[PDB]
Amino acid sequence: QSEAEKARKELLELEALSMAVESTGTAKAEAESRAEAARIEGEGSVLQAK
Amino acid sequence: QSEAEKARKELLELEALSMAVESTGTAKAEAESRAEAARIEGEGSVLQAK
Numbered sequence: 508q509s510e511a512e513k514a515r516k517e518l519l520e521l522e523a524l525s526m527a528v529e530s531t532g533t534a535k536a537e538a539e540s541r542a543e544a545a546r547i548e549g550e551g552s553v554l555q556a557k
Numbered sequence: 558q559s560e561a562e563k564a565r566k567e568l569l570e571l572e573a574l575s576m577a578v579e580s581t582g583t584a585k586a587e588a589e590s591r592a593e594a595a596r597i598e599g600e601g602s603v604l605q606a607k
Binding site: 514517518521522524525528529531532533535536537539540541543544547548550551554555557 | 558559562563565566569570572573574576577580581583584585587588589591592595596599
């Protein structure tokens, strides 16, 4: 069981890296989509105001 | 399982890229459609005012 835990430590490190990658990817994708939509809406608003 | 997680990290990176592409594409498409509609409506409004 000690040897199994020795391997499980590295396995958990890899799992943590994968989880961080997935979470940051999802968050950045949603944030960038919303930001692009807001920028387009703002430019349209400027033109409509003119 | 450690090797499987090693591969899964790259798989999740690719999935994050694909998700970001899809989200930004949908958002920008909807925003640009609404902006074009607003611009056409504004030009029509100017002509109607004249």
